[PDB]
Design a protein around this ligand. Structure first.
Ligand SMILES: CCCCC/C=C\C/C=C\CCCCCCCC(=O)O
Lengths: 48, 49
């Protein structure tokens, strides 16, 4: 599944309270930037 | 710290570990070592948890 989010705000630490992270691989960003900075659009592709 | 949460000590992580408990400094050379003291070594020494 895929969702694209525009014109919204997100409380990220509430979403990280629901999961435990084993490993993250990031290119050209960091999760700290996604915890602080703003951007034009957000796309999430999630599967099991 | 257990191995199931060693990604919290990875660089760029947004977990509370880095921003409240241990913020590693990278201005000077470093090595972060995740090791396990086994039970037999733990009883051989006085190492407990
Ligand atoms: C439920 C998490 C995945 C869904 C996220 C959806 C929207 C949030 C968008 C950007 C924030 C991503 C930061 C995640 C930090 C995990 C890495 C870590 O610091 O350990």
């Amino acid at each position: 599944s895929r969702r694209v989010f525009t014109n919204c705000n997100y409380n990220l630490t509430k979403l990280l309270s629901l999961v435990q992270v084993d490993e993250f691989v990031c290119h050209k960003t960091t999760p700290e930037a996604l915890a602080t900075g703003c951007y034009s659009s957000l796309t999430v592709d999630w599967f099991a | 710290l257990p191995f199931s949460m060693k990604s919290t000590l990875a660089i760029g992580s947004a977990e509370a570990i880095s921003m409240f408990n241990y913020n590693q400094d990278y201005s000077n050379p470093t090595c972060r070592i995740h090791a396990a003291v086994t039970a037999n070594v733990s009883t051989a020494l006085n190492f407990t948890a």
